[PDB]
Design a protein around this ligand. Sequence first.
Ligand SMILES: Cc1cc2nc3c(=O)[nH]c(=O)nc-3n(C[C@H](O)[C@H](O)[C@H](O)COP(=O)(O)O)c2cc1C
Ligand SMILES: Cc1cc2nc3c(=O)[nH]c(=O)nc-3n(C[C@H](O)[C@H](O)[C@H](O)COP(=O)(O)O)c2cc1C
Ligand SMILES: O=C(O)c1cc(=O)[nH]c(=O)[nH]1
Ligand SMILES: O=C(O)c1cc(=O)[nH]c(=O)[nH]1
Lengths: 311, 311
Amino acid sequence: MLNTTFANAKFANPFMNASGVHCMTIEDLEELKASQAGAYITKSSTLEKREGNPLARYVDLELGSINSMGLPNLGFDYYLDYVLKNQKENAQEGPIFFSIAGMSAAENIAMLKKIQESDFSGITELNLSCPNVPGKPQLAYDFEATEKLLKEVFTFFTKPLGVKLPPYFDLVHFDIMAEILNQFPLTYVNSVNSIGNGLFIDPEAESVVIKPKDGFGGIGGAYIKPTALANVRAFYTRLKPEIQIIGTGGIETGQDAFEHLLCGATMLQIGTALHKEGPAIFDRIIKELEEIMNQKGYQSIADFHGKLKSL
Amino acid sequence: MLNTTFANAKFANPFMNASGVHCMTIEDLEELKASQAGAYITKSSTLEKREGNPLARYVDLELGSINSMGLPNLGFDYYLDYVLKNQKENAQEGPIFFSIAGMSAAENIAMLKKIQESDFSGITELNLSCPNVPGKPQLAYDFEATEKLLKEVFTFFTKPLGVKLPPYFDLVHFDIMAEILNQFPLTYVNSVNSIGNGLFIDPEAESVVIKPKDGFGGIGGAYIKPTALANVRAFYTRLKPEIQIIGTGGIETGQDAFEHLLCGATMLQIGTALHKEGPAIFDRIIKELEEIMNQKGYQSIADFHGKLKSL
Ligand SMILES: Cc1cc2nc3c(=O)[nH]c(=O)nc-3n(C[C@H](O)[C@H](O)[C@H](O)COP(=O)(O)O)c2cc1C
Ligand SMILES: Cc1cc2nc3c(=O)[nH]c(=O)nc-3n(C[C@H](O)[C@H](O)[C@H](O)COP(=O)(O)O)c2cc1C
Ligand SMILES: O=C(O)c1cc(=O)[nH]c(=O)[nH]1
Ligand SMILES: O=C(O)c1cc(=O)[nH]c(=O)[nH]1
């Protein structure tokens, strides 16, 4: 019942990991491949391998998570070599998704050229929102710099490309961004990365709980669902239908997933809850969603996709 | 133990209602005066009375609230006449706070000129984040327009003035705004208004839960505490010490208040939790904070104010 078409490919169900979670090593990626996820995405990579930030850099909270990982990753070539070899042995009803988060515009262009030049036939996700690098305004909060980068990208990049966006909080920003993105042949937008630079405090110790950046980190989980649904819905009513949506933020239960799909998401990614539970989450949440659909008489996601009702 | 000095005035404790909650009529305001709040603030006003948005416009949520009130208020002259008459009968160890939220730059200047010309001797709060008017980018997300307005204001306004800001999510935005505000003789900044334009869905009805704006509204409560603490802390390490801070966002318990004061807030405001519980919240949360302080050996807020430790 959760069969999905996205970016002209067929998936068994819309669920994926969110970039950054369970997707750093080839071993992690093979575990996602073995799970019941519909599709999976690599850790956002940079040209050089990176150790990332000092530890403690991820903390589980009652209502979600806070992190400032610092883009720890094994480097672009490691992920590219893995996906290229995994295309060479044909199996996943499913392109692999490949996230990049260069430390500059130049680095993102350089990685996109290598992807474009390679045989990669999967789907690439450009991270415009990589939030826990110290010293850089999220690129997707600078509308002019975003537009300039995308213009340069689409002078050469003809393979399927989505962008990973930070949350926006003002309807006029949704208007401005949809006007920028609508001029390109983008495959998708992925809404939302972490809510940026929140703070969690241990009141007993009177201190922050993560080490980097004086304790400020991206917030995920149940704290952010209201903003994530809003971002998915607000782009769903504004983007051209050529650009589809991946919804990420606060997905733990089948009900949370239902809600993103009702707003207009086509694939769904799970971050915080997958961190906590491990890839057994995918079997649990697919069953929760199917049970919701069965109670409502729904046999396919097209029965309620995008059909959130106003009052 | 909770005696506080702020804006050169003395208050019995730092707690207040947040603007918008329990502060629309004279009767509401007299109930906050009667309660144990240390101080209180009026509903944001406009020059003309406004009925505000269609109903359902406020909803209680398990983790906070969503609202799109539309700035329902009884109009500037009604609040000004009330505070002016309440200054005339001398009592509150405590200036009243007066919030304004003009529908334009002109209306805000017009109301500020009336306050400056009146005998008002309390404190004014200029709302730069009034989020549920349909058709207007939050003014405080437009740094150029914010700076231009504040420049004009401080050509004439000599009385104690604070600004109510929306949450920021990028450390560079904290830098830009602190640079703008630090050039003025502002009394305070009040961080945070709601998280803007979030969405809450009833999955059984498959619809949004508030009427105006296709169900998008400001989010308050426990959802937003990580963001509000970050915004208080980030302005506390950047603002000149002349500009003090009011923390608002997700305060329900003594521990939540403790955390905001640890970040640097001097006064605290309670929105969602006061909506739910009514003015008896002030007695409860004062006692909770006092108990935390007693357990730590603290006899005054200065023992821990702003002393949040990094790792
Ligand atoms: C541990 C961690 C690492 C993250 N790293 C990335 C990453 O490399 N790239 C990406 O685009 N987002 C990353 N994020 C953001 C997630 O992809 C997702 O957008 C965020 O956690 C919102 O989802 P959630 O509520 O399910 O956690 C990361 C999140 C987590 C918790
Ligand atoms: C019912 C509603 C009305 C609001 N109206 C205003 C108001 O007129 N002006 C103001 O500056 N903020 C208003 N806000 C925002 C609150 O002052 C406070 O910034 C927001 O609720 C965050 O606090 P909380 O987590 O304690 O709710 C209102 C909030 C509530 C829920
Ligand atoms: O690796 C990081 O810290 C990271 C990247 C990103 O895009 N989002 C986030 O929450 N963490
Ligand atoms: O009146 C409104 O809707 C209101 C104004 C404000 O500044 N903040 C908010 O949450 N609601």
